[PDB]
């Protein structure tokens, strides 16, 4: 039948068989050939299954501020009238002040008081927080669940200052660029940024399936058997108004 | 057993007992399944089904093991339940295989420690030293990267790690995770009196 | 480390840093060779059994405190608890009813030639 | 970026005119300007593509 | 096997994982800043890749 002929189709996908048994040699070819279609698919399902469980490859949210600009799932922070702050409020590229957008009209939460308090609202909710690029630089090496996404902003600059006129502003500047050329710069700066052994990370083994990975065969099997059961009141009216 | 977590193998038993009853219960409630096997001149009431609660149940664990079975669902009502049991045991399989083949080669990718460069990227491993001794003072002026990044282990985290005395450092390495560096000679003494030691590196 | 029998510890501070704070740790201890009730931590020194597993780390490295904590096993049983021993339970609850019901249909009702409607 | 260069306004050897440009360099940083004429310049005719 | 060791294979990413990759060559403008930068760097890996 038609019934019968589509219980062939999934009868030989799910790999089980059944009786409906290819007798002639025209069907016998959609036999042999929807056998080898599922034995492809389960073949690479399987395979690549085993590819999942064996190298985590985790993708990422936000990647670029702008990017962070359309996530209002994903609230901001900045430490409190700090410069990033103030970089924000009087800024014009429409992203930025879109950015200024949120943390404006919600304030309240967002705007945080320190920087390492700021540090906590990331690693305890899902929070963006704008501090300054070097600092992440020496936070993300010595904390290694966290990282750095996207880029640099604005550019400032650090600088050894002199009194209003004094001939320690020139002949330092001599001084400075040459430590820059010469690598010492650089160096220090890979002595004290350098982090305490942040490679800990690797493929690790899953150690199970739980219901949290594979959890939603257990919904589509009790979604199959409540729509059994609509069917299986079907044939008791259809059956019994075609019997009377 | 290990790649499926044990409350996984305790709902699979129980869907087994489940879905075998709720397709027992359908196969005597069912209209359309009620057939007649007569080879002679039908109607006299030999009109029967195929499915026991012993027969239900041994299409359960049939089609869970992938073999089969000749209890051959056949009203629409019973085989949508045939249509997902298959379905539930096509990704249980299917993710039994695919785990156990993470757990056979995550054990064959990780490489043991076997040179003091891969000690200096385990700080999950802990170093080692005599206090004070021919060791401790190779590392402190030593000028290879490598080995001033292990003395800046030992260095900045003094305090537990450069432990006191030869036979007190065997035994951190005895209960802990030690990496303890001395003089290669005293490992092989060492190594070949106490077996369950070893030495790794050069 | 102190090699004699009592020791006299001193604060001073004044009016210019009266907010200070430190916070000690003593333990008596003898040479080796080292007798019962005495865990012999190896750090030349024997502490008194009354140290072990109290939560002071004292001969510096965790020796008393390391290897020492009781717990308990059976993975299999380290779920039959609160929710989620629950949720076993409740589908336990659906399971077994349909068990149940499943044996009255068999018996009550035969397979060998009867009508086309029963069942629950 | 491996190494850190930059690039400069230039002057004579002693002038006035090193110092007060830097003024007027470092306002319009803050300004958003100079960054706003890099987005003019730098800025290419349709790549995006969305990767 | 196919499928997971394409996914271990990750893309050259970060100067000292092209100091590895000697299947894929480098290069430089002949001698500008950058060429003139390597040959009197310290670090390790620089050297290595003016090696
Ligand atoms: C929430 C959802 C709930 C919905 C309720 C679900 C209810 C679905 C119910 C389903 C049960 C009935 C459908 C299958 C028929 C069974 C075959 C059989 O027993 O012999 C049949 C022979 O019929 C034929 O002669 C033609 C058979 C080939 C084509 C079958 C129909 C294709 C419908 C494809 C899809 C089907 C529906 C798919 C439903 C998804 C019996 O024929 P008859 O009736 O005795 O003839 C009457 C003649 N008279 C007046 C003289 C007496
Ligand atoms: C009785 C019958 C037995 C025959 C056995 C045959 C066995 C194999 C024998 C020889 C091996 C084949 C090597 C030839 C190379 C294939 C050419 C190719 O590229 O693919 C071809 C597709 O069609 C095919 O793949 C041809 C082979 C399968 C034919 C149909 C299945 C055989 C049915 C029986 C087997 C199962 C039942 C078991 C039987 C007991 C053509 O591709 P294309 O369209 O040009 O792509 C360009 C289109 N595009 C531009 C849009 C992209
Ligand atoms: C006869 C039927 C009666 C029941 C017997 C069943 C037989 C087998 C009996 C027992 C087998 C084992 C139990 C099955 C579920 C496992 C428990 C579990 O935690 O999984 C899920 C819970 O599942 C739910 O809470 C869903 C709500 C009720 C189910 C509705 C099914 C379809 C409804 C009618 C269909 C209509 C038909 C179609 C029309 C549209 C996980 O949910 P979660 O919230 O994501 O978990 C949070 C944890 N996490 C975020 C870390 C992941
Ligand atoms: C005669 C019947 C023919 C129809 C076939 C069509 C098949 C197409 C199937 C699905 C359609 C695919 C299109 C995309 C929609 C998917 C979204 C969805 O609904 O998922 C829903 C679950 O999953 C289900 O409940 C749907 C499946 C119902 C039971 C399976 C029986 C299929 C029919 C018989 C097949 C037997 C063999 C085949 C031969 C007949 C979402 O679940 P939820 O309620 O949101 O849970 C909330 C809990 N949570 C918050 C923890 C998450
Ligand atoms: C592919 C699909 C197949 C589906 C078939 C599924 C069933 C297959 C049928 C039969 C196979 C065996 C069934 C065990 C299933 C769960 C047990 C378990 O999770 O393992 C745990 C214990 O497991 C054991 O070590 C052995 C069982 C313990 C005995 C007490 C429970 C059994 C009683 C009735 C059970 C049912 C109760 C509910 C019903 C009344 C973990 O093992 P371990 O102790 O940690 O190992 C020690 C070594 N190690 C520590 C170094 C690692
Ligand atoms: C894996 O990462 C997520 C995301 O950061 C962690 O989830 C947060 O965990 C902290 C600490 O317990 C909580 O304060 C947050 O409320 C959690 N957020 C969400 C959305 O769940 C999760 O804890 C991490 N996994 C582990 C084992 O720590
Ligand atoms: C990093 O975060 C995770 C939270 O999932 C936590 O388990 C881990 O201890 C954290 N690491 C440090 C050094 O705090
Ligand atoms: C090595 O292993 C344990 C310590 O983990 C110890 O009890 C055992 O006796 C040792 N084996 C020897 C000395 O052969
Ligand atoms: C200190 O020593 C005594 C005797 O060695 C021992 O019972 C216990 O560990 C300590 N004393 C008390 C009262 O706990």
Not at chain 1, 166 to 188: C, F, N, V
Not at chain 3, 108 to 119: H, I, L, N, S
């Amino acid at each position: 039948t038609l019934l019968n002929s589509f219980w062939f189709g999934v009868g030989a996908l799910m790999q089980q068989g059944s009786e409906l048994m290819p007798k002639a040699l025209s069907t016998r070819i959609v036999g042999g050939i929807w056998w080898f279609f599922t034995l492809i698919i389960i073949s690479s399902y399987t395979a690549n299954l085993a590819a999942f469980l064996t190298v985590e490859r985790m993708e990422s949210p936000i990647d670029s501020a702008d990017d962070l600009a359309k996530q209002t799932k994903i609230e901001y922070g900045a430490v409190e009238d700090g410069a990033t702050m103030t970089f924000f409020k009087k800024s014009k590229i429409s992203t930025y002040d879109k950015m200024w957008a949120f943390m404006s009209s919600r304030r309240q939460s967002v705007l945080v008081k320190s920087n390492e308090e700021g540090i906590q609202r990331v690693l305890t909710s899902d929070y963006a927080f704008l501090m300054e690029s070097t600092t992440i630089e020496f936070v993300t090496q010595r904390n290694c669940n966290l990282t750095q996404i996207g880029g640099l902003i604005d550019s400032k600059g650090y600088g050894v200052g002199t009194p209003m006129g004094s001939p320690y502003r020139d002949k330092i500047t001599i001084a400075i660029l040459q430590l820059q050329e010469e690598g010492k710069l650089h160096m220090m700066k890979e002595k004290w940024w350098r982090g305490n052994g942040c490679p800990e990370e690797e493929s690790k083994e899953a150690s199970a399936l739980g219901v949290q990975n594979i959890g939603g065969i257990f919904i589509v099997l009790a979604a199959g058997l409540v729509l059994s059961v609509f069917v299986a009141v079907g044939e008791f009216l259809y059956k019994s108004k075609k019997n009377a | 057993l290990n790649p499926l977590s044990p409350d996984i193998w305790m709902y699979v038993l129980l869907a087994c007992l489940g879905v075998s009853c709720v397709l027992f219960v359908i196969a005597r409630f069912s209209p359309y399944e009620w057939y007649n096997p007569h080879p002679c001149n039908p109607d006299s009431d030999v009109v029967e089904n195929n499915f026991t609660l012993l027969n239900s149940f041994w299409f359960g664990v049939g089609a869970l093991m992938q073999q089969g079975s000749e209890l051959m669902p056949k009203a629409l009502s019973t085989r949508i339940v045939g249509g997902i049991w298959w379905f539930f045991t096509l990704i249980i399989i299917s993710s039994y295989t695919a785990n156990l083949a993470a757990f056979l080669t995550v054990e064959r990718m990780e490489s043991p420690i076997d040179s003091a460069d891969d000690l200096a990227k385990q700080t999950k491993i802990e170093y080692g030293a005599v206090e004070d001794g021919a060791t401790m003072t190779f590392f402190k002026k030593s000028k290879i990267s490598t080995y001033d990044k292990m003395w800046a282990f030992m260095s900045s985290r003094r305090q537990s790690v450069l432990v006191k005395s030869n036979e007190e450092g065997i035994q951190r390495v005895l209960t802990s995770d030690y990496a303890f560096l001395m003089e290669s000679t005293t490992i092989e003494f060492v190594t070949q009196r106490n077996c369950n030691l070893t030495q790794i590196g050069g | 480390m102190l090699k004699t029998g009592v020791g006299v510890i001193r604060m001073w501070a004044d009016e210019g840093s009266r907010l200070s704070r430190f916070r000690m740790l003593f333990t008596s201890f003898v040479e080796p060779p080292c007798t019962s009730s005495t865990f012999f931590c190896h750090s030349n020194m024997c502490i008194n059994n009354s140290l072990v597993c109290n939560g002071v780390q004292n001969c510096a490295y965790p020796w008393d405190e390391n290897h020492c904590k009781e717990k308990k096993k059976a993975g299999l049983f380290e779920q039959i608890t609160k929710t989620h021993g629950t949720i076993i339970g409740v589908t336990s609850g659906i399971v077994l009813v349909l068990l149940i019901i499943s044996i009255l249909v068999q018996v009550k009702q035969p397979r060998k030639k009867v009508m086309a409607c029963k069942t629950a």
